[PDB]
Coordinates of C-alpha atoms and ligand atoms in Angstrom, one line a residue:
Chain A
X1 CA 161.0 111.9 113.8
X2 CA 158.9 108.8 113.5
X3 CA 161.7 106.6 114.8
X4 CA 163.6 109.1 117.4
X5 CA 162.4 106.9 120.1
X6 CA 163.6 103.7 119.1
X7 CA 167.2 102.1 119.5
X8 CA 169.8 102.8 116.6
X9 CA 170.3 98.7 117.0
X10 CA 166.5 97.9 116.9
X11 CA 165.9 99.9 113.8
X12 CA 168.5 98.0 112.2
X13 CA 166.9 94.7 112.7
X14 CA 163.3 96.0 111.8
X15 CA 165.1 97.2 108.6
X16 CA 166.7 93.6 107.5
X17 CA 162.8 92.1 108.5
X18 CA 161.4 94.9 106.3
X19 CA 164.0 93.5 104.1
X20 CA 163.1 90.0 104.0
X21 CA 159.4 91.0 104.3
X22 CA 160.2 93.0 100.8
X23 CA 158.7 96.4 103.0
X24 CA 161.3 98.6 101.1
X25 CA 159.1 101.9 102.3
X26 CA 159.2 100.7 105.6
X27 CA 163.3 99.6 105.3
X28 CA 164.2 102.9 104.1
X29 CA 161.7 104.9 106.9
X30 CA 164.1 102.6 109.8
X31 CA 167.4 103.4 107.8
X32 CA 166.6 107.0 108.2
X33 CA 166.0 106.5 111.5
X34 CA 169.1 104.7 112.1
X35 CA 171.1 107.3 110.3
X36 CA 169.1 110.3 112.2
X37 CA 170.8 108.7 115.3
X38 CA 174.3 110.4 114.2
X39 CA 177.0 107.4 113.8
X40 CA 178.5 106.5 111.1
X41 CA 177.5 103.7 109.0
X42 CA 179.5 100.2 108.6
X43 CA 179.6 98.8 105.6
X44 CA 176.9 96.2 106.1
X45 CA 174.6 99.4 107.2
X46 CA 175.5 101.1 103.9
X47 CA 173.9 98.2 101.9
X48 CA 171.0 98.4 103.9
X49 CA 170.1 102.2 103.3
X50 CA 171.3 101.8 100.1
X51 CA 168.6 98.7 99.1
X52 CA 165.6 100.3 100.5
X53 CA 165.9 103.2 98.8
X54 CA 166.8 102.3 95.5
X55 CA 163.8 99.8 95.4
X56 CA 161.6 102.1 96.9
X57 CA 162.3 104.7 93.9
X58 CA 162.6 101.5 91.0
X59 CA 159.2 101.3 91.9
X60 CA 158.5 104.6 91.1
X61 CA 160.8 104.6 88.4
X62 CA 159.2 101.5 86.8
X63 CA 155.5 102.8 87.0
X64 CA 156.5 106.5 86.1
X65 CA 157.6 104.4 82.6
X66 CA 154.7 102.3 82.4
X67 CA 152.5 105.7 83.0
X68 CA 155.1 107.6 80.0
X69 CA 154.2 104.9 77.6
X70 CA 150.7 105.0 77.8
X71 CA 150.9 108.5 77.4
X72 CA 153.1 108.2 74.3
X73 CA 150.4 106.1 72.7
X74 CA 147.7 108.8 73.5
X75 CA 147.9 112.2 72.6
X76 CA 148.5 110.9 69.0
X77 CA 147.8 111.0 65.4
X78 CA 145.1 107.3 65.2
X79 CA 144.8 107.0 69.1
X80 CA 142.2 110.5 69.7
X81 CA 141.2 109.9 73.1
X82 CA 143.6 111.9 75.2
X83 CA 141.6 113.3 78.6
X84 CA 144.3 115.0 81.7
X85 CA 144.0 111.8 83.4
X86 CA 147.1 109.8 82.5
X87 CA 149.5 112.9 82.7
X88 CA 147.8 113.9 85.9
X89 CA 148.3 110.4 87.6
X90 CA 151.6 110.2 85.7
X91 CA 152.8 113.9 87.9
X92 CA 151.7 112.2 90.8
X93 CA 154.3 109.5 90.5
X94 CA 156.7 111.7 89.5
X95 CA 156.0 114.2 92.7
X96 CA 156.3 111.6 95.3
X97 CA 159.7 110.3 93.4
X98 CA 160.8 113.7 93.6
X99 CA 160.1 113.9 97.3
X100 CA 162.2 110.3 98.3
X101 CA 165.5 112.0 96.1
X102 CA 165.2 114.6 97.7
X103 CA 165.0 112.7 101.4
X104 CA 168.1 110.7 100.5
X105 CA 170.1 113.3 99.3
X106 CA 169.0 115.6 102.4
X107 CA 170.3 112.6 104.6
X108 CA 173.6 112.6 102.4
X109 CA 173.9 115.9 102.3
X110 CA 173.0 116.0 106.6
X111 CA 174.7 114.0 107.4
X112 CA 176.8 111.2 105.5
X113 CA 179.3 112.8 103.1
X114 CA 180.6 115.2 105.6
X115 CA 180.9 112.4 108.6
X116 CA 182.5 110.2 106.6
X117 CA 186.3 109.4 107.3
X118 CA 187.1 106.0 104.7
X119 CA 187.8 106.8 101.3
X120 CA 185.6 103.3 100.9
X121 CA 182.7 105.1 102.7
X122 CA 183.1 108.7 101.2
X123 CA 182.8 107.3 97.0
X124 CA 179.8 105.1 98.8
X125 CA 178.2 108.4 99.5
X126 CA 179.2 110.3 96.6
X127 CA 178.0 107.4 94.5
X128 CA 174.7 107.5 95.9
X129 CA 174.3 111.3 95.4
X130 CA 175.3 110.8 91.7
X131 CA 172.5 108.1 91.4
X132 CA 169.3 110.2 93.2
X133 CA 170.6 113.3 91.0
X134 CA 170.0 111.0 87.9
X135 CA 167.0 109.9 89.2
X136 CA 165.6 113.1 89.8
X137 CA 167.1 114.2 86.0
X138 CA 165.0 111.5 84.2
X139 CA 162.0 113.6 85.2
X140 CA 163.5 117.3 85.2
X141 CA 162.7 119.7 83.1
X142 CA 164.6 123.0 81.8
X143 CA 166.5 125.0 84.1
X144 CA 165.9 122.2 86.8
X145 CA 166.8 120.0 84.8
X146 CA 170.6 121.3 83.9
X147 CA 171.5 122.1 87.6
X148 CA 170.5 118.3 88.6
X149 CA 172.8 117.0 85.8
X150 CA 175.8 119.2 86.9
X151 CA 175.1 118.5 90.5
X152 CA 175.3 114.1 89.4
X153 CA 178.2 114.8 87.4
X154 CA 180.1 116.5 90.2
X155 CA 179.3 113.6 92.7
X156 CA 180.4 110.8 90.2
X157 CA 183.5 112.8 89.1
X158 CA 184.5 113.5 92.6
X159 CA 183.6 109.9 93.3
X160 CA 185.8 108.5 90.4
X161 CA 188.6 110.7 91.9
X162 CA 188.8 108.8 95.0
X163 CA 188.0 105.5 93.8
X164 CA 190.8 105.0 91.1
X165 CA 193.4 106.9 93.9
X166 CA 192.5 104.4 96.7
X167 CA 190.7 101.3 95.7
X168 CA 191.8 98.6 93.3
X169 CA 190.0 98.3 90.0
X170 CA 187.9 95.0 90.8
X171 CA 186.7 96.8 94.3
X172 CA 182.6 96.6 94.2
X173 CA 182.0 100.1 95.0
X174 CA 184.3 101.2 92.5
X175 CA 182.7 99.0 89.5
X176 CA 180.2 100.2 90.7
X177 CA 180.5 103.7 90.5
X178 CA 182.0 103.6 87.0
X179 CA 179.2 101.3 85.9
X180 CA 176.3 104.0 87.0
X181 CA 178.4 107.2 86.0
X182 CA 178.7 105.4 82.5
X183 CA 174.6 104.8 82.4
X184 CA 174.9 108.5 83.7
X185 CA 176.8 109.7 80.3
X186 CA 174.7 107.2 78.0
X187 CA 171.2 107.9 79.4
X188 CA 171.4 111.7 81.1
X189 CA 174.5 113.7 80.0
X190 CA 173.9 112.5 75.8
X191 CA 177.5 111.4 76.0
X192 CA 176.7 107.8 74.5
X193 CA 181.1 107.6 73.5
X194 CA 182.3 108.7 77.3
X195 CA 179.9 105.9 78.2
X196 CA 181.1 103.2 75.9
X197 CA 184.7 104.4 76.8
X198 CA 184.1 104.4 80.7
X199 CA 182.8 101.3 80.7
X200 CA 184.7 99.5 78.4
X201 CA 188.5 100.5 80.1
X202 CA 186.3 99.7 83.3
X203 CA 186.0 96.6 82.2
X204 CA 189.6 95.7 81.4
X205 CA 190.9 97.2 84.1
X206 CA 189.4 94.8 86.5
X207 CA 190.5 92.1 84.0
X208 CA 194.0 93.2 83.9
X209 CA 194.0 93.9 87.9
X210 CA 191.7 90.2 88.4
X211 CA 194.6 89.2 91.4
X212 CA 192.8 92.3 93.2
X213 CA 189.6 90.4 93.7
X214 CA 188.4 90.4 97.3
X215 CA 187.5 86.6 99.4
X216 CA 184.7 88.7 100.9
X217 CA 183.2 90.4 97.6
X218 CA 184.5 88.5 94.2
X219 CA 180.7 87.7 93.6
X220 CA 179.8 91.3 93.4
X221 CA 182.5 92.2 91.7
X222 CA 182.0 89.3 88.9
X223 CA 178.4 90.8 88.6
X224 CA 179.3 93.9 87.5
X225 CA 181.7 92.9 85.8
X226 CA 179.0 91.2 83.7
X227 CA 176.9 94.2 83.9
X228 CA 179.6 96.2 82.4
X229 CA 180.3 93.9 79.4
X230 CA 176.4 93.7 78.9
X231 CA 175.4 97.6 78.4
X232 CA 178.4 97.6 75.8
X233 CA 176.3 94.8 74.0
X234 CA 173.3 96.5 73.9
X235 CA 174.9 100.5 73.5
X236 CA 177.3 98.8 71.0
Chain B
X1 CA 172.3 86.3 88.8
X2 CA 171.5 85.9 85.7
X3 CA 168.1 87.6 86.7
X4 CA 169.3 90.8 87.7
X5 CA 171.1 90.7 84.2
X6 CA 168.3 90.1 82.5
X7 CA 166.3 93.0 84.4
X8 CA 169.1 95.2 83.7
X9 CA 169.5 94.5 80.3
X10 CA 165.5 95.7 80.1
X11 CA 165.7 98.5 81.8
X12 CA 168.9 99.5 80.1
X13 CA 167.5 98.6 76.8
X14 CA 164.0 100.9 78.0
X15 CA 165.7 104.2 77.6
X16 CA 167.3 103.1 74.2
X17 CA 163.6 102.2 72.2
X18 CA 161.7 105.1 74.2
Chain C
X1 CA 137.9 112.5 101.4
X2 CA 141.2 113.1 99.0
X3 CA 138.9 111.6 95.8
X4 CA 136.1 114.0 96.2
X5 CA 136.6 116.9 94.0
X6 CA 137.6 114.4 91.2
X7 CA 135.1 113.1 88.3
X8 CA 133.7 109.5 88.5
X9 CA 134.9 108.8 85.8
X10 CA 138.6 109.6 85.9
X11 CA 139.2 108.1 89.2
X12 CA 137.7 104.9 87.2
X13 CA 140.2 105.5 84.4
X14 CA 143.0 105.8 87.5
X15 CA 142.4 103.1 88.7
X16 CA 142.5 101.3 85.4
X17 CA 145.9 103.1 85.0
X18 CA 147.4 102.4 88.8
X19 CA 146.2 98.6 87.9
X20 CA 148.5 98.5 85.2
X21 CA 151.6 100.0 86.9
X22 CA 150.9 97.5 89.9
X23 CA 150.3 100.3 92.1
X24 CA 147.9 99.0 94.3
X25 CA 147.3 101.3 97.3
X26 CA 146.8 104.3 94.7
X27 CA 144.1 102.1 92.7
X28 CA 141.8 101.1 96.2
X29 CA 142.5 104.4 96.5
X30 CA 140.8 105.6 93.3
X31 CA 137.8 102.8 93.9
X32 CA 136.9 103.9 97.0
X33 CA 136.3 107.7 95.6
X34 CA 134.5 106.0 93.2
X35 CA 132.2 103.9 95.6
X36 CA 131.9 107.0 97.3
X37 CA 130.1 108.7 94.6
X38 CA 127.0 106.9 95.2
X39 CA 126.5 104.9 92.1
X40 CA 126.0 101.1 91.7
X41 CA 129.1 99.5 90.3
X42 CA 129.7 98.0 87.0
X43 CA 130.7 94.3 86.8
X44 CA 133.8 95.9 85.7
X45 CA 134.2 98.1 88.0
X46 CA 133.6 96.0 90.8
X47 CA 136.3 93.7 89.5
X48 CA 138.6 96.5 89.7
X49 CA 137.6 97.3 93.6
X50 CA 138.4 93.7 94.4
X51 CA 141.4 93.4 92.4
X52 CA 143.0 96.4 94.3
X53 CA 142.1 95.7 97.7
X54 CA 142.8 92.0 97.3
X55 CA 146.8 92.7 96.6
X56 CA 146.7 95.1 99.5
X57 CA 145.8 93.1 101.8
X58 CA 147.3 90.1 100.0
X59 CA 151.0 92.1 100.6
X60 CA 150.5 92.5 104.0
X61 CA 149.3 88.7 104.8
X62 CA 152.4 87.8 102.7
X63 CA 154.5 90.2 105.0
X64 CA 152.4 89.1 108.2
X65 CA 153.7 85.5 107.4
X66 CA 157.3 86.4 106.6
X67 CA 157.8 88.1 110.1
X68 CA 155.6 85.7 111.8
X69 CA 158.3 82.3 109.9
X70 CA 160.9 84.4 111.7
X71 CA 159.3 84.9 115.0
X72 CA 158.8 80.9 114.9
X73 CA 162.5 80.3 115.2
X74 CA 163.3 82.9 117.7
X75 CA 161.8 82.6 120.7
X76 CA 162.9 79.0 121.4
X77 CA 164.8 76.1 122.2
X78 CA 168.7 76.3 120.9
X79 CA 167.7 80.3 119.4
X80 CA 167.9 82.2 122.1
X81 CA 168.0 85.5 120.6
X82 CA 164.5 87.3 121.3
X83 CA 164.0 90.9 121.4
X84 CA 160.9 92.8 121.1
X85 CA 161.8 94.0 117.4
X86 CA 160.1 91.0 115.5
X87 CA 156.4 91.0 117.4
X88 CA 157.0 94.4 117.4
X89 CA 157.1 94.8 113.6
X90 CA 154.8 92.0 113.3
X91 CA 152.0 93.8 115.1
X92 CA 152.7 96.9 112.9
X93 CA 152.1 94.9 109.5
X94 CA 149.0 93.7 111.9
X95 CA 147.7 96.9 112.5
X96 CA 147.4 98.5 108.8
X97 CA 146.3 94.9 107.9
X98 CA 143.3 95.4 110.3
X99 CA 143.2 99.5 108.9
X100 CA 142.8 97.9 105.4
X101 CA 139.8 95.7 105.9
X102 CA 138.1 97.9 107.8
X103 CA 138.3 100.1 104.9
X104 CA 137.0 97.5 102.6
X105 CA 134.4 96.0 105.2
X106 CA 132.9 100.0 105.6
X107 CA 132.7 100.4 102.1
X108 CA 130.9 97.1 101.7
X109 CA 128.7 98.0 104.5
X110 CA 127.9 101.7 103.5
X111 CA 127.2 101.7 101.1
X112 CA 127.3 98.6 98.7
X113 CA 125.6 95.9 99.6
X114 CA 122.3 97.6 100.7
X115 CA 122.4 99.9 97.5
X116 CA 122.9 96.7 95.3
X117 CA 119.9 95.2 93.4
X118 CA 121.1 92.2 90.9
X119 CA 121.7 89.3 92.5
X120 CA 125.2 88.5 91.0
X121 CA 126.0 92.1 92.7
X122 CA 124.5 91.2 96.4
X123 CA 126.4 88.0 96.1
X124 CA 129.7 89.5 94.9
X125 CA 129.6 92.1 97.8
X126 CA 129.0 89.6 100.4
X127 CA 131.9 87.2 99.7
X128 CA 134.1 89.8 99.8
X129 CA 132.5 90.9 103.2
X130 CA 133.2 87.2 104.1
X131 CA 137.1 87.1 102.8
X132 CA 137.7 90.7 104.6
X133 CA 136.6 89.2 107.8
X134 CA 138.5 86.0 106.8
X135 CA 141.5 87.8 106.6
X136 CA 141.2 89.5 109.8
X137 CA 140.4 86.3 111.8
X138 CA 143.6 84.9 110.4
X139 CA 145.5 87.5 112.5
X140 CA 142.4 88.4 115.8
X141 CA 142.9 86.4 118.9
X142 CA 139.7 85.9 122.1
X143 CA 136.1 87.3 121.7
X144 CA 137.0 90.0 118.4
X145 CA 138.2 86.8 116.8
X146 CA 135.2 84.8 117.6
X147 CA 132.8 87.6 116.7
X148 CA 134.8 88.5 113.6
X149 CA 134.4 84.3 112.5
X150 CA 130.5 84.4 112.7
X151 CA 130.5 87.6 110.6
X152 CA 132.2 86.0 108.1
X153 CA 130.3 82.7 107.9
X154 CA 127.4 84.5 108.5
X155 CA 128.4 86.7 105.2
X156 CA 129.3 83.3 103.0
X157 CA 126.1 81.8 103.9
X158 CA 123.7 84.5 102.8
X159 CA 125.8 84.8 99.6
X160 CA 125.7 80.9 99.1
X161 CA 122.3 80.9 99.8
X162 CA 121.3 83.2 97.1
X163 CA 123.8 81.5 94.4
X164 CA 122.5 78.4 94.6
X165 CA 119.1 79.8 94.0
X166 CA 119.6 82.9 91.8
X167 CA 123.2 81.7 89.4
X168 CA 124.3 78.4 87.2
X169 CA 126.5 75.7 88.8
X170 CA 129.5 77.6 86.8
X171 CA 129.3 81.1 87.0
X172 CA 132.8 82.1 88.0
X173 CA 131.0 84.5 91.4
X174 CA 129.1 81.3 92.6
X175 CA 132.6 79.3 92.1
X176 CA 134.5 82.1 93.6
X177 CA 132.4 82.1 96.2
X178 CA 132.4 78.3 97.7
X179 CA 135.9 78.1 96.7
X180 CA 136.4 81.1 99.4
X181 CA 134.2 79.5 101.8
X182 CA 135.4 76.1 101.2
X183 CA 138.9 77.7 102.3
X184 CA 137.1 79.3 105.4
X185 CA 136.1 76.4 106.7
X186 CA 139.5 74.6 106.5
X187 CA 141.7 77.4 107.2
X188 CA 139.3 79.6 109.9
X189 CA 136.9 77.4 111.3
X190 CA 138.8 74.5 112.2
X191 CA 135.9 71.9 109.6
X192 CA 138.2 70.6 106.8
X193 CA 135.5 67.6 106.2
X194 CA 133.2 70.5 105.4
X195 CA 135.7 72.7 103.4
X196 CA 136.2 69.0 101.2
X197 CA 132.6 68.1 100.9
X198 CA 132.1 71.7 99.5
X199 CA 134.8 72.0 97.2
X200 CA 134.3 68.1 95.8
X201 CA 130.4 69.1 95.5
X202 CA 131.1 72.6 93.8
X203 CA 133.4 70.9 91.3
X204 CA 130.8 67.9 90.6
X205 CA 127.8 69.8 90.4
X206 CA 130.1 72.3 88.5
X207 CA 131.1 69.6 85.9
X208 CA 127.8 68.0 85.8
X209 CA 126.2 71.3 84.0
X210 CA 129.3 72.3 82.1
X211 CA 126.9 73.1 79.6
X212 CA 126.0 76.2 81.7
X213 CA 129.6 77.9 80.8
X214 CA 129.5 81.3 79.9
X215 CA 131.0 82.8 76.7
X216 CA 131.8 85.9 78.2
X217 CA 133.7 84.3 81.3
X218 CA 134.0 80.5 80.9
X219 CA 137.9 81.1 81.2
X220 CA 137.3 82.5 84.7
X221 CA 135.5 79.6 85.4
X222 CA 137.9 76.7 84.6
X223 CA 140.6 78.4 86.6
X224 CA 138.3 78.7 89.6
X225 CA 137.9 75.0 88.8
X226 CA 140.6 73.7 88.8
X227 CA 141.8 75.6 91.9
X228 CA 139.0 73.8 93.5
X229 CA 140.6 70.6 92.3
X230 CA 143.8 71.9 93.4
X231 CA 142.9 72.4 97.3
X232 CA 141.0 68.9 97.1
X233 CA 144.4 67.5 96.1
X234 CA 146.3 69.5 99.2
X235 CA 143.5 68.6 101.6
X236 CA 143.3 64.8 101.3
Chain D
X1 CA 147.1 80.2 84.9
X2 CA 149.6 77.6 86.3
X3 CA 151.2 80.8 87.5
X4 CA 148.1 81.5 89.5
X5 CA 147.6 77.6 90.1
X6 CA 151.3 77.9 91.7
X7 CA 151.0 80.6 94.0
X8 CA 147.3 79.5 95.4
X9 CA 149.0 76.1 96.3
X10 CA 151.7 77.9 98.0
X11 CA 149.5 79.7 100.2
X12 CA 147.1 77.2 101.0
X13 CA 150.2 74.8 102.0
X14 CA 151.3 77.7 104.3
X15 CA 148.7 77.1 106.5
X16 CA 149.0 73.4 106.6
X17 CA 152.7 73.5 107.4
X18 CA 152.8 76.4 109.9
Ligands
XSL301 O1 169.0 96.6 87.0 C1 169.3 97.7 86.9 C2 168.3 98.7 86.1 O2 168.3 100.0 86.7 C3 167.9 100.2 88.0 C4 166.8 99.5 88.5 C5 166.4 99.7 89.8 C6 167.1 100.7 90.6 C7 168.2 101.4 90.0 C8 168.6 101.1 88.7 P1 170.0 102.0 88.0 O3 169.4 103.0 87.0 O4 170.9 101.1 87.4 O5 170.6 102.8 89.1 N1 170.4 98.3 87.3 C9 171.5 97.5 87.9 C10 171.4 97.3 89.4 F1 170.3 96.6 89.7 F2 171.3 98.6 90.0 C11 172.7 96.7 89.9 C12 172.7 95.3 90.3 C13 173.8 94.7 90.7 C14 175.0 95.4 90.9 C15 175.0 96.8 90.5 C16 173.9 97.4 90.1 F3 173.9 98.7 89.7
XSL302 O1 146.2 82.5 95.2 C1 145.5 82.5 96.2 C2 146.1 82.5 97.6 O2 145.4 83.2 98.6 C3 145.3 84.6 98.4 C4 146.3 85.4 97.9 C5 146.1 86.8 97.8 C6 144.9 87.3 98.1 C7 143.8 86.6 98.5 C8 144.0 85.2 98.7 P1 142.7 84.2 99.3 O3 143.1 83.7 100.7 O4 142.5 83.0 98.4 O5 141.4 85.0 99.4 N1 144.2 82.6 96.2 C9 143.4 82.4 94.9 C10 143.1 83.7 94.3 F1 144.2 84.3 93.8 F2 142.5 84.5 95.1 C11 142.2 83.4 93.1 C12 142.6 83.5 91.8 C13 141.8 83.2 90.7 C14 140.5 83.0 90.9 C15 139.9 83.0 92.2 C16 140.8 83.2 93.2 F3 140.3 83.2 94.5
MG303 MG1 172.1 105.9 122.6
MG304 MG1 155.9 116.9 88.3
MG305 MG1 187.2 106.5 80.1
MG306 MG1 128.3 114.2 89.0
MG307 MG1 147.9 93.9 116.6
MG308 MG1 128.7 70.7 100.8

């Protein structure tokens, strides 16, 4: 515990100056440090573990991609000049992804799901585990690779439970969720119809529930909204 | 806004071509 | 040394790789364990060396000015809302800033510039030694920072000195070079008449044997030029 | 290049305004 010795409030702050100072590594290392502390999380808090870490694996998302493609040209009928290096630097990536899902969902697992008492806070959670199990199933393989995808669909499904028993349909968290757990079917599961479905009654559920829109979060809401309506362009 | 939509959109549209 | 067991050659094809997926740490990573081999540098490879540590260091400056904005406003009259957590931080960024170029500068120092023979390489090694103590004057304070200034002038000098003699009025290392010292003097060494004189006198003498322009890097030249012309236009 | 051109003008004003 890097961060055992410092303040639950002062990690906070360093994290929205790692924030601003686009230090996502160093944002998530004073989240974990904030959660490590044992209280719950307010909502505000949530945003901010949530942020570091998802840019810190995008990263390694976006350059395990770039890495894939060049491999897909090489190793190829035309394009004979293959060598271990792009696969070996490619693992690499994909090891130290590995290694930050498996962080979050170790602080999810101990200690966020459990200590959670809002319904809001609990599909947060739930949510979050869904995403860093589809993370890690974008580079799984075989036996791995089907425990990973029934361990994200259990999170989401849980999560979707909750969400449409206690929060209205235009709620962020619960757009949200639906939005990621319909990538989840499209891009993971091979359920391309469930994901077209999800989305779409997503969709006009928070258009025919639009009064439910929140003074403090319409603007998220709206962007999902648009997210929504713009995967079932491009999966449609 | 129209930003992240347009980043989403590529990323989206990523898993689709590859 | 992490590098050591790895071919020269792939850690130059990693590099190359680590480059393209913007991964910057892992590609100075991958040129040092290739410095470290013992062989001169290509002009390529060279490139690549500079390229990586240049956006290392470059993100940490960008983050060093973010959290030093923010510490301007606090600290003062009408905010007062101080805490330790923004010097804090600040000196943290400062730290692995400082880590960085001492990295760079040992390399450079053993074993780079004494092993190199061409002219265009001697040069090229000692403007970087002069921008890695550049960007450690912009954060040293007392005597290191005074020592650390003459270094770097001391560095520029000996490279300018041998450009002038040994390159054309356009090759792209000479321009590179004064633009770098031109910015040394206005930013570092408190002697903006200088930094003008040079940059006007670069561009002129530049201009006046544009005949000199290399097919093989006359693009690198005119953008070196006109950011010459650019600073001349922020300076007066 | 303007790209480039944008972000070196950027940086070199930092200095001159802080
Ligand atoms: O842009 C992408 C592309 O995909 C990723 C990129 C970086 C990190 C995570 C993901 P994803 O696979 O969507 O979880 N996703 C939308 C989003 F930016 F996340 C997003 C933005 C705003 C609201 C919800 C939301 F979800
Ligand atoms: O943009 C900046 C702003 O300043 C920095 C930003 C990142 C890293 C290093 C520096 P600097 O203080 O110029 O060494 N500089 C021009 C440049 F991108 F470097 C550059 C580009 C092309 C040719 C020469 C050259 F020099
Ligand atoms: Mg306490
Ligand atoms: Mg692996
Ligand atoms: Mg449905
Ligand atoms: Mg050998
Ligand atoms: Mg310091
Ligand atoms: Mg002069």
């Amino acid at each position: 515990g890097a961060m055992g010795s410092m303040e639950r409030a002062s990690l906070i702050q360093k994290a929205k100056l790692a924030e601003q100072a686009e230090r996502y590594e160093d944002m998530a290392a004073f989240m974990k440090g904030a959660v490590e502390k044992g209280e719950e999380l307010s909502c505000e808090e949530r945003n901010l573990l949530s942020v570091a870490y998802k840019n810190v694996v995008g990263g390694q998302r976006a350059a395990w991609r770039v890495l894939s493609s060049i491999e897909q040209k090489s190793n190829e009928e035309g394009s004979e000049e293959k060598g271990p290096e792009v696969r070996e630097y490619r693992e690499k990536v994909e090891t130290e992804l590995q290694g930050v899902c498996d962080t979050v969902l170790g602080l999810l697992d101990s200690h966020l799901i459990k200590e959670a008492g809002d319904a809001e806070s609990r599909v947060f959670y739930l949510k979050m585990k869904g995403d860093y199990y589809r993370y890690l199933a974008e580079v799984a393989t075989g036996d791995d690779k089907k425990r990973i995808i029934d361990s994200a669909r259990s999170a989401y499904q849980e999560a979707m439970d909750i969400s449409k028993k206690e929060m209205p349909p235009t709620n962020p968290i619960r757009l949200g969720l639906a939005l990621n757990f319909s990538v989840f079917h499209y891009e993971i599961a091979n359920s391309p119809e469930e994901a077209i479905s999800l989305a779409k009654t997503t969709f006009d559920e928070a258009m025919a529930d639009l009064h439910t829109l929140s003074e403090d979060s319409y603007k998220d809401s709206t962007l999902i909204m648009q997210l929504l309506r713009d995967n079932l362009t491009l999966w449609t | 806004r129209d930003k992240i939509r347009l980043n989403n959109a590529i990323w989206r549209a990523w898993y689709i071509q590859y």
